[PDB]
């Protein structure tokens with residue numbers, strides 16, 4: 597449920 601991009 598978060599996103600990113602790391």
Ligand SMILES: *[C@@H]1O[C@H](CO)[C@@H](O)[C@H](O)[C@H]1O[C@H]1C[C@H]([NH3+])[C@@H](O)[C@H](C)O1
Pocket residue numbers: none
């Ligand atoms: C991430 O969210 C964006 C904005 O809502 C979408 O436009 C994008 O298509 C999404 O990224 C894709 C590819 C990604 N690797 C995957 O984890 C997500 C679910 O869908």
Ligand SMILES: *[C@H]1O[C@H](CO)[C@@H](O)[C@H](O)[C@@H]1O
Pocket residue numbers: 598602
């Ligand atoms: C990727 O990892 C970073 C570092 O722990 C988090 O901040 C992020 O929420 C995701 O898990």
Ligand SMILES: *[C@H]1C[C@H](N)[C@@H](OC)[C@H](C)O1
Pocket residue numbers: 600601602
């Ligand atoms: C999300 C966008 C970001 N610029 C990328 O780093 C190379 C990451 C892997 O995906």
